[PDB]
UniProtKB/Swiss-Prot annotation:
Domain Lipoyl-binding: 1-76
Designated name of the protein: Dihydrolipoyllysine-residue succinyltransferase component of 2-oxoglutarate dehydrogenase complex
Record function comment: E2 component of the 2-oxoglutarate dehydrogenase (OGDH) complex which catalyzes the second step in the conversion of 2-oxoglutarate to succinyl-CoA and CO(2).
Protein family according to the UniProt entry: Belongs to the 2-oxoacid dehydrogenase family.
Oligomer and partners: Forms a 24-polypeptide structural core with octahedral symmetry. Part of the 2-oxoglutarate dehydrogenase (OGDH) complex composed of E1 (2-oxoglutarate dehydrogenase), E2 (dihydrolipoamide succinyltransferase) and E3 (dihydrolipoamide dehydrogenase); the complex contains multiple copies of the three enzymatic components (E1, E2 and E3).
Positions bearing N6-lipoyllysine: 42
The organism's place on the tree of life at top rank: Bacteria
Segment of the intact protein contained: 2 to 80 of 399
């Protein structure tokens, strides 16, 4: 499957913060559709799905911080 982890932060920043979980784990998704945003130093990035399937579960909650290699959730097998 595909495990989703947090991005790497520079020196000034030693962590990050989730942005907003548009959808939730346990629903349907479609490639080319936003899935979760991320918060960086001072810029909000976006995370789109690279293929439909079934999410597993999100361990981090919106408004929380995420460390490098932080597992935010995992993808399930499709088909």
């Amino acid at each position: 499957a595909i495990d989703i982890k947090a991005p790497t932060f520079p020196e000034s920043i030693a962590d990050g913060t989730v942005a907003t979980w548009h959808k939730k784990p346990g629903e349907a998704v479609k490639r080319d559709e936003l899935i979760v945003d991320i918060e960086t130093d001072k810029v909000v990035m976006e995370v789109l799905a690279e293929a439909d399937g079934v999410i597993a579960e999100i361990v981090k909650n919106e408004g929380d911080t995420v460390l490098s290699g932080e597992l935010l959730g995992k993808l399930t097998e499709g088909g």
